Swiss-Prot record, chain A:
PROSITE patterns (alphabetical): RIBOSOMAL_S27E
Subcellular location: Cytoplasm; Nucleus, Nucleolus
Protein name as catalogued: Small ribosomal subunit protein eS27
Phosphoserine, modified sites: S10
Organism annotation: Homo sapiens (Human)
UniProtKB/Swiss-Prot annotation, chain B:
Positions where Phosphoserine occurs in the chain: S29
Family the entry assigns: Belongs to the universal ribosomal protein uS15 family.
Lineage: Eukaryota, Metazoa, Chordata, Craniata, Vertebrata
Designated gene of the protein: RPS13
Subcellular location: Cytoplasm; Nucleus, Nucleolus
Residue positions, PTM N6-succinyllysine: K26, K33
GO biological process, one term: negative regulation of RNA splicing
GO MF term (any one): RNA binding
Modification sites for N6-acetyllysine: K26
Gene Ontology CC terms: cytoplasm; cytosol; cytosolic ribosome; cytosolic small ribosomal subunit; extracellular exosome; focal adhesion; membrane; nucleolus
Protein species of origin: Homo sapiens (Human)
PTM field: Ubiquitinated at Lys-26 by RNF14 and RNF25 in response to ribosome collisions (ribosome stalling).
Pfam families: Ribosomal_S13_N (PF08069), Ribosomal_S15 (PF00312)
Protein name (database record): Small ribosomal subunit protein uS15
Domain of life of the organism encoding this protein: Eukaryota
Swiss-Prot record, chain C:
Gene: RPS7
Protein name: Small ribosomal subunit protein eS7
Superkingdom: Eukaryota
GO BP: cytoplasmic translation; negative regulation of ubiquitin protein ligase activity; negative regulation of ubiquitin-dependent protein catabolic process; neural crest cell differentiation; neural tube closure; positive regulation of gene expression; positive regulation of intrinsic apoptotic signaling pathway by p53 class mediator; protein stabilization
Location of cross-link Glycyl lysine isopeptide (Lys-Gly) (interchain with G-Cter in SUMO2): K63, K67
Curated annotation (Swiss-Prot), chain D:
List of residues that carry N6-succinyllysine: K87
Natural source organism: Homo sapiens
Intracellular or extracellular location(s): Cytoplasm; Nucleus, Nucleolus
Protein name: Small ribosomal subunit protein uS8
Gene3D superfamilies: 3.30.1370.30, 3.30.1490.10
Amino acid sequence: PLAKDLLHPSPEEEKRKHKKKRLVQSPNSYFMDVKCPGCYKITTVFSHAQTVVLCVGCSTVLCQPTGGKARLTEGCSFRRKQ
Amino acid sequence: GRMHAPGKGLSQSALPYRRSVPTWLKLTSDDVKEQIYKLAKKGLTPSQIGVILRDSHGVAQVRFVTGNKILRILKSKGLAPDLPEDLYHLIKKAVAVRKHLERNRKDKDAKFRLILIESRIHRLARYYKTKRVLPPNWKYESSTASALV
Amino acid sequence: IVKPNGEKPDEFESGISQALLELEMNSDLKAQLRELNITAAKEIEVGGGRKAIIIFVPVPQLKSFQKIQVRLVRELEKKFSGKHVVFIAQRRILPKPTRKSRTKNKQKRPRSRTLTAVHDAILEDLVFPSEIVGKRIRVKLDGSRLIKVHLDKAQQNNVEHKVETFSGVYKKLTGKDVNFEFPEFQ
Amino acid sequence: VRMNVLADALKSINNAEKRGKRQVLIRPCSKVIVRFLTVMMKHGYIGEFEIIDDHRAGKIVVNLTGRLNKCGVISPRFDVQLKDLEKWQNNLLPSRQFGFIVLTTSAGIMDHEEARRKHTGGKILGFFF
Amino acid sequence: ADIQTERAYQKQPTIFQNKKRVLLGETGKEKLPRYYKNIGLGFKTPKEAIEGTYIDKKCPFTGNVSIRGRILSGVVTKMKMQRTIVIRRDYLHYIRKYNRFEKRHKNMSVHLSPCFRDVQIGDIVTVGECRPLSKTVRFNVLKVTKAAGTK
RNA sequence: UAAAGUUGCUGCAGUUAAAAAGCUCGUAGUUGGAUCUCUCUCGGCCGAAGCGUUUACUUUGAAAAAAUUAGAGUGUUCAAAGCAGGCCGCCUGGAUACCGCAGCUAGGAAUAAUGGAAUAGGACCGCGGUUCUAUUUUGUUG
Ligand SMILES: [Mg+2]
Ligand SMILES: [Mg+2]
Ligand SMILES: [Mg+2]
Ligand SMILES: [Mg+2]
Ligand SMILES: [Mg+2]
Ligand SMILES: [Mg+2]
Ligand SMILES: [Mg+2]
Ligand SMILES: [Mg+2]
Ligand SMILES: [Mg+2]
Ligand SMILES: [Mg+2]
Ligand SMILES: [Mg+2]
């Protein structure tokens, strides 16, 4: 305590903190590139998706809504964007 | 804290610092606008439009891409709700609780919650009157509440 | 090429216009700069014996410029030798409304045409290849300020050597001291 | 709900100084807050501070030197004339040798001594000593 | 708009309306000349008063009244009387023991001329002091400014 | 009246000493988050004209009975007082301040309200139109 630099927070404890309580608020979510097991072409998906994302180029269900992060279908791969 | 509940929760979205469109986003402002228009024709409120665009089409903030908010976009072209969506949802909730109450006369929690919902409706309606969104003679009536929704 | 608002082109503006024309003659991106139209240019001393070039691109054509900004900058760097080139949109700062004024404005001043907003946009365009990750204003003991800008590291090198060029440009056209640094991570 | 951000800032810095901490973060920030912190600067009571630009409202990280006994706000912001300034500083300040009353006049934000020099009254904001 | 609705004949006293006219100059009616005056203090005469036909002896522009003394402003609160309205003036009264103000108001019945049409509950009126026009009316509406959100 | 910070604006108290409504909603009231750095015409470069949304606030200026209060001068023998007095016919006073609030006045523009374009019921340039109208015409008349 006492002499603790609030100007230069450490990255680990900055991620440790709540998203709204950081020096500058940074959301915890991200955008994923989801690849279906059979379809050759990728889809952009929100991590905390609240809707049943359907394959635009097929009938496969890509993710299911949950309390927090959306659950990807088994086999459907994903890569973090940016 | 909550307006009508004792709870004091801290749960909301945290928009990022960067207001620039991400490079991977290949959608143009016009494409986003047409997607918004057809989603509105499907019968969705601006909230649902934003959720669908964020979930499936990979746009973070429509205002961030098109330089303009969703409701303004809908009102600009013409197809916008007669009364604001939050007021509409409040009226719908009040109608539902009233319908439940008229048959369950013994329910006293429902009466209390209904009064809370009416207070919220009145506050919102008075605010919208002061901003000229609603006509000054617009008033909430239980008899015509179901008609409005 | 240059179309000044005051319709008084000068020697450096003419040089910039003929250089852009030469690009339109011998660079595949000709079809871009045939439509585009810059408005002003200036050469200003920046570091010791060094100088820098500022091109006042029009606001509505800013994004079209930023589409091929990197190519334009590299080509002008080759043509102008060691002369750094920065593209900054030309924005009008309407005067602040004052009780001792007149009919100069029958409409409220838009927030985009304000000193603070104009300066923020000027900095953003000044560091276009990078992104403004953060901003920190430090107030010194003498009352002076210092705007320290956190830029993305993704595109460091590209403007890493261009450090102290943006600072000089901003000190010239804005009058405020600005320092640039790259955060370790986000 | 939160009103008079200046009161919250002054309470935060006062509590941090009572606790012996070397830096304090204040949020939200404001131009009134920055001017008050600067008049506290020029008299050596606070130290260097830095503004963090969150796009909603900035934060201020304030370095603290142990020279600050009290800093507070006076609400409501009463209008003070030149005649009543003596009564106000008799009430608020601990001595005539040190301490300052801060006020907004049309000339800006400044301590009571500068307001006397410029012959301008205004509205009281707070005090520090 | 018929202007003869009283038992007596309504007419501007200064204007003479029975000047002899030859048949050669009988192109319909003579377009009865209108009496109007320019009240000072930089107040413009409404075009309605100049080109109107109403008879109002209390009108500051076409009647027999002199604007003198105090010029005040108020908000229109009621318009339920004939040719006169009730405006509200709000202010803060200082209390020295507490160094604090309290909100006060007083209503004022002011004569409103037919030259000011489309006056709504809520607009601002600049009124000017005149001689007593009734038991409670001592002011005449000189200018009307619309509310902040009018159509 | 002070003591009485035992009426508390300054500046009091409400767990147990007297004290927070049984609980919630809710009109009025009170309070309310960041944010925005004077000119075109008239008269002799100025004097004029608006109006910059309006203020609140702050500073100045004017108008504000005397007595009383503060206060300058003056040995009532001193003093409370008084407006007198001093020099060898002259000389010299009978000042000044203060006077809430509201109302006038002119600077300042931080603070605090308020507005200015989103059915464009927008600004500026020129255009064109529609209508009515004052006088130019013109030694004169006409
Ligand atoms: Mg509540
Ligand atoms: Mg007593
Ligand atoms: Mg005492
Ligand atoms: Mg007690
Ligand atoms: Mg008890
Ligand atoms: Mg209780
Ligand atoms: Mg209330
Ligand atoms: Mg505020
Ligand atoms: Mg007196
Ligand atoms: Mg005396
Ligand atoms: Mg006065």
